[PDB]
Amino acid sequence: HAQGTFTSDLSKQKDEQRAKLFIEWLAAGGPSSGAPPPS
Numbered sequence: 001h002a003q004g005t006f007t008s009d010l011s012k013q014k015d016e017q018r019a020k021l022f023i024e025w026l027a028a029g030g031p032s033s034g035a036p037p038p039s
């Protein structure tokens with residue numbers, strides 16, 4: 001539905017930011033960094 005397009009895009013926008021924070025956390029060390037992951 002119209003929502004299907006938007007909710008999926010809006011989550012893609014957010015999911016992307018969430019994933020990018022996870023990548024920046026992996027770059028920081030991942031479990032090695034010491035900081036919990038963005039979760």
Ligand SMILES: *C(=O)CC[C@H](NC(=O)CC[C@H](NC(=O)CCCCCCCCCCCCCCC)C(=O)O)C(=O)O
Pocket residue numbers: 007010011014
């Ligand atoms: C971005 O585009 C918008 C996305 C947004 N969706 C969410 O925020 C979904 C979050 C939701 N989690 C929570 O809201 C946190 C609370 C979860 C509570 C779970 C309760 C489970 C048991 C309930 C039993 C009820 C029994 C009957 C009572 C009469 C999630 O993870 O989905 C949006 O706006 O859609």
